[PDB]
Amino acid sequence: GGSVQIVYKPVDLSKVTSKCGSLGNIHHKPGGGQVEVKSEKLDFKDRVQSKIGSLDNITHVPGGGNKKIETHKLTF
Amino acid sequence: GGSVQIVYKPVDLSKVTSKCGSLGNIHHKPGGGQVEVKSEKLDFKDRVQSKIGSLDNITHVPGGGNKKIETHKLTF
Amino acid sequence: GGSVQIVYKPVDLSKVTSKCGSLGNIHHKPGGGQVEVKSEKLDFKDRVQSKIGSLDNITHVPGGGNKKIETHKLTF
Amino acid sequence: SVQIVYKPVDLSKVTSKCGSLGNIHHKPGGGQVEVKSEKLDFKDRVQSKIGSLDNITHVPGGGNKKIETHKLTFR
Amino acid sequence: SVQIVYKPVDLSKVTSKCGSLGNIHHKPGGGQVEVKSEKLDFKDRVQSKIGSLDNITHVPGGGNKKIETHKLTFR
Amino acid sequence: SVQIVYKPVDLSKVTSKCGSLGNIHHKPGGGQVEVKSEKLDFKDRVQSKIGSLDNITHVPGGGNKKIETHKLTFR
Structure with a gap:
């Protein structure tokens, strides 16, 4: 017959990352x-x-927020 | 016959990254x-x-925010 | 016969990156x-x-924000 | 007949006198x-x-190396 | 007949006198x-x-090397 | 018949006298x-x-090298 097949298989492996402030620094023997x-x-x-x-x-981080919005819609 | 096949398989492997502030620096024997x-x-x-x-x-990071919006729509 | 096949397989492997402020610097024996x-x-x-x-x-980073917008639409 | 006499003689001296030897220091004053x-x-x-x-006496040197080789070959 | 008399003689001296040898310091005053x-x-x-x-005496030198090769070949 | 006498004689001296040797320092005053x-x-x-x-005495030098070779070949 006049059949219909819909396969809805979207894939998300994505990364959202914030690295904010003082990260991975080396302070070796500081001082006067x-x-x-x-x-x-x-x-x-x-x-x-x-x-x-x-x-x-001193490290202040008011920022570094992550917002992710995802929407999926299938209408037959 | 007059059949229909739809295969909706978008793939996302993307990266969104912020690296903000003081990262990976070396301070070796600072001082007067x-x-x-x-x-x-x-x-x-x-x-x-x-x-x-x-x-x-001193590190201030009001920024470095990430916003990701993704939308998917299939209408038959 | 007059069948229809649609394959919707876009792939995203993109990188969006901000590197903002003081990154990867060497300060070796600074001082008067x-x-x-x-x-x-x-x-x-x-x-x-x-x-x-x-x-x-002193590092101030009000910037370095990332915005990614993606939209996918299939209409039959 | 063949006669070979092999009688090399070594009475030689190899010497190092390195550093501070045989000095007189009579009443040195710092x-x-x-x-x-x-x-x-x-x-x-x-x-x-x-x-x-x-x-102060420092002697990295004053080393001796002696190499001697004897070969007698017949036929 | 053949006769060979290999009788080399070595009474030689190889010597290093390096550094501060035989000095007299009489009442040196810093x-x-x-x-x-x-x-x-x-x-x-x-x-x-x-x-x-x-x-201060420093002697990296004053080293001796002696090499001595003897070869007798018959036929 | 053949007779070979090989009797070289070495009474040689090779000597280095390097640095500060045999000096007199009478009442030096800094x-x-x-x-x-x-x-x-x-x-x-x-x-x-x-x-x-x-x-101060510094002696990187004053080293001696002696190389000696004796070869006798018959036929």
């Missing part, structure tokens, strides 16, 4: 030799950030 | 020899950032 | 020999950034 | 040594020697 | 040594030697 | 030495020697 601050007064007021001989690693 | 600040007064007021001999690694 | 600041007063007011012998690595 | 150090930074390997009076 | 160092930075290898009086 | 250093930066290898009085 000598740091000296000599004063009679240190007077810090009203939103002061002071760093003296410090080591800081 | 000597840092010296001599004063009688240090007077810091009202939104001061002071760095004396510090090492900072 | 001697840094000296000599005063009677340091007087810092109202939105001051002061760096004395510091090393800073 | 002075006062002062090494004052502050606020130094070293990022790589340091080798340091400090002292008043050194006698 | 002076006062001062090394004052401050606020120094070194990014790579440092080799340092400090001192008043040094005797 | 002066006072001062090395004042501040605020220095070195990006690469440093070799430093500081001192009042040095005797």
Whole structure:
């Protein structure tokens, strides 16, 4: 007869990846030799950030989000 | 006879990748020899950032987002 | 007879990649020999950034986003 | 008839006198040594020697090689 | 008839006298040594030697090689 | 008839006298030495020697090579 065959076999092996921030870095022996601050007064007021001989690693990642939308429709 | 065959087999092996920020770097023995600040007064007021001999690694990643949209439609 | 065969087999092996910021760098022994600041007063007011012998690595990545849109449509 | 007499004679000397031999050091005096150090930074390997009076002898050499070969062949 | 008398004689000397041999040092005096160092930075290898009086002898050489071949062939 | 006498004689000397041999150093005096250093930066290898009085002897040479060959061929 006038038969109909539909085979709907879509295949997804895809990857969505975010690598965001500080990844796979090497920090080998970081630091200064000598740091000296000599004063009679240190007077810090009203939103002061002071760093003296410090080591800081700071990572902020507001991003790196993944959105995947997939839709399938078969209508006979 | 007057038959119909439809074979809907799309294949996706694709990659969507973000690599954002500080990735795979080498920092080998960073830092100054000597840092010296001599004063009688240090007077810091009202939104001061002071760095004396510090090492900072700062990474901000608001970006690096991935969006994937895929749509499939078969109408007979 | 007057049969119809449709084979719909598109294949996607594509890569979409962003590499944004500080990637794969080598920083080997960075830093000054001697840094000296000599005063009677340091007087810092109202939105001051002061760096004395510091090393800073700063990476901002608002970008590096990926958008992939794919649509498939078969109508008989 | 054939007669072969093979009588080579070796009384030879091979000698090395290498380094510091037969010296006289009568009352050697090293002075006062002062090494004052502050606020130094070293990022790589340091080798340091400090002292008043050194006698140093180093001998990688002074080796002897003697090769001797005797071949007597008849017919 | 044939007669062969192979009788070479070796009384030879091969000698190396290398370095500091037979010296006289009578009351050698190293002076006062001062090394004052401050606020120094070194990014790579440092080799340092400090001192008043040094005797240094280094001998990579003074090696002897002797080679001696004897061949007698009859027929 | 044939007679061969092979009687070479070697009384030779090969000698090397290399470096500092047979010297007299009567009351040598190194002066006072001062090395004042501040605020220095070195990006690469440093070799430093500081001192009042040095005797340095270095001998890479003074090696001896003796090669001797004796061949007697009959027929």
